[PDB]
Amino acid sequence: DVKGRILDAAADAFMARGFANTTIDDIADEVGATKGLIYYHFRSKFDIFLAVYEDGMRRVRERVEPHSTAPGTGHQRLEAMSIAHLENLMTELGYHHVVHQGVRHQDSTALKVRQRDALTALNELRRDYERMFRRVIAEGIADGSLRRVDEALATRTLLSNLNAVDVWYRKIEGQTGEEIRELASQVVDMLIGGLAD
Amino acid sequence: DVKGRILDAAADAFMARGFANTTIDDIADEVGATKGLIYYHFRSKFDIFLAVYEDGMRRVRERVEPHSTAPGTGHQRLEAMSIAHLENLMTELGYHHVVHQGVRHTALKVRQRDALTALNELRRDYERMFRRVIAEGIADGSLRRVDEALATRTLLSNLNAVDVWYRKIEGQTGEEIRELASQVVDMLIGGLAD
Amino acid sequence: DVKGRILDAAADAFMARGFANTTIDDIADEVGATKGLIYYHFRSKFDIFLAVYEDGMRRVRERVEPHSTAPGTGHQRLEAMSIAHLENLMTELGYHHVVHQGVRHQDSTALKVRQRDALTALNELRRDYERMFRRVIAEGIADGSLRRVDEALATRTLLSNLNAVDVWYRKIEGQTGEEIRELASQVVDMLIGGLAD
Amino acid sequence: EPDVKGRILDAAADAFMARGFANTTIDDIADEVGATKGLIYYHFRSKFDIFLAVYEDGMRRVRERVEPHSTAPGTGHQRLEAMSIAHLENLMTELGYHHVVHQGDSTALKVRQRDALTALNELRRDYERMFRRVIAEGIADGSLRRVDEALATRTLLSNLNAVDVWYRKIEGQTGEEIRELASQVVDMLIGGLAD
DNA sequence: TAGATACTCCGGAGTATCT
DNA sequence: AGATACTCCGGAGTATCTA
């Protein structure tokens, strides 16, 4: 809808300059409207952050979730989903770096009630996403395919691993689904397989 | 002394809230004086950032550059390197969080854009050595033969983002830290499924 | 049109007090609105200094350019050009001051990359305009009219010296065009002619 | 041996020329001389003091090293041509000091110090008085042409001053070579273009 | 859309006290 | 005799609101 036009606009500017440096008129001329359309559709500057958070975080789930019931060993099964995770990062890059930031801004802001409720739901529904990988690494060492390492560290770092890719990856904007998934092929196995022999 | 007291109080403060929402007097009550002595030593709020970015990295290349010519193979030196790298990240995570966060990002003096750039590609010198020991780690290969250009930029990036989940387990000795950095690099260098 | 009125007041204010003593509120007062109007049309304080500086370069070029492409010798072109150059100083005295103190403190003061570059993106328009006065002083130094003297310093001197009229010039409000043209012709004979014969 | 206050004013004057009067701060003047703010404020009562201390010395430099060419023998042109030379040399050795002279009350100022700026601006017109005479002593003398001696004074010293637009520095040449660089310019301003 | 209003936070001059 | 530190304050900029 029209809201997504601002959501698409704010996302890229949110990576380039963060939250506070991103001013409301810094994203007003970018989409091509005065400050009213931002305030007609979004009651506050924090609301834009949450709506982008509430969209992109479902974007990730809706694109990885069906890879959890498909059959395979926990290395074969999880590699299948986590390839599609780097896929989602690279296609809708705007909605994927916003999920790194967050609680940093809740501290600095004197929060309204509605954002504090919406933030909380997103606060654990990311944790529930962590449960998926916390769930489907278990089958990795339950079907005997992964290094028998700590059940928490393997989860915490690998999601920390997968998301840190947006430090160097800028864009291609023309990268077909082949080069997207085939760049996603060598980066998951780089982390999954490691560097050892 | 007095300056070093401010740099610490500024470093963790920049980590805790971010350069944008860390007011000058917000970092002045941690040291116990008024903004007067915070601005007396550093002419700008951006100059403090450059005084942390230049010590935080100077304190990380004093552990991991020593492990460039040492008793080890490709992995046995790279593991020794990445332990002492992720070591200081674990001890002074305040001084760490500025560098890789403060990359994508404003008004800037002539002596500041270059001074930030002359420090933002000194971080490329840190990256230069890690690609140098992955090539050394492939000729005398104890590690896999994947492409250099991207695998060099991943593991270092993978190992700077340890802080997103990493707490501060209070009471750590020198022994706790190096072992705490042990299983994470073996998580990361050795990887999984091996 | 209001943006021009902001530039008109800004050029008046910027000339009289400078850049520093010119506060955002001052331009708002001389236009007749609050601080918000000034920021509704411009991203920053400096982003209007380019607007005054960029517009002022058009004004002279729109009215001084034909006199370089006109019949006559090197003397007959400078006089037709230099008079019209002073006809701009003596009419829009505000705009013409902005193109003096724009290069000096550029290093010593902060600017965004899209602003400091936009500064020197217009600072060629000074040199690309001084090119016209190097192109026609040229066609006199060897082609008859102008005294044989180095092409470079004669362009440094003349331009810096018919631009130094703002030191003493004071616009008598209620001015007429034929009065200003007469005063311009007076000074030029002082400048191109000299004092010898 | 060295002079503390002189090192402050020489460093401050060039600071005023580059950044401006506002863009240079008090600690900015503490860096070029390599000192602390308290040294500035134990010697100078305020930052406006700095500006009247270089203005007072800019004149004593400008007014003194150019006066002996209004009394030197020669016509009104012979005086003026050599008079403008020692003025250009002066600007080109005292870039900060001379640029202050044409860098002049829109706010309430301290009376004791205000009463010196307006006076200092009266040694100002006192300087262009000599330019007023030698031009008038030359226009109908014959060495110069017929010109509005008011205009010929306004537009000439403002022109001889207009050099600091492009002249940065050399600091490799000396009096003999700086004589050449000023010579071509006064020959421009005095001689003209068309012949 | 067009501005007005509130308000913060950065930086600088000036002053007070200590070195 | 300067240094160090503090205090006061201006004003640029940005968020929210109101016509």
PDB file of C-alpha atoms in Angstrom, chain D residues 48 52 109-119:
ATOM      1  CA  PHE D  48      37.421  41.583  20.956  1.00  0.00           C
ATOM      2  CA  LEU D  52      41.795  45.768  18.402  1.00  0.00           C
ATOM      3  CA  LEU D 109      29.957  46.691  23.168  1.00  0.00           C
ATOM      4  CA  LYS D 110      32.053  47.694  26.159  1.00  0.00           C
ATOM      5  CA  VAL D 111      32.391  51.478  26.123  1.00  0.00           C
ATOM      6  CA  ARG D 112      36.108  51.561  26.980  1.00  0.00           C
ATOM      7  CA  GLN D 113      36.827  49.276  23.995  1.00  0.00           C
ATOM      8  CA  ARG D 114      34.153  50.666  21.655  1.00  0.00           C
ATOM      9  CA  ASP D 115      35.769  54.078  22.149  1.00  0.00           C
ATOM     10  CA  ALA D 116      38.937  52.596  20.618  1.00  0.00           C
ATOM     11  CA  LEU D 117      37.457  50.829  17.574  1.00  0.00           C
ATOM     12  CA  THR D 118      35.649  53.936  16.333  1.00  0.00           C
ATOM     13  CA  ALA D 119      38.886  55.827  16.987  1.00  0.00           C
TER      14      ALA D 119
END
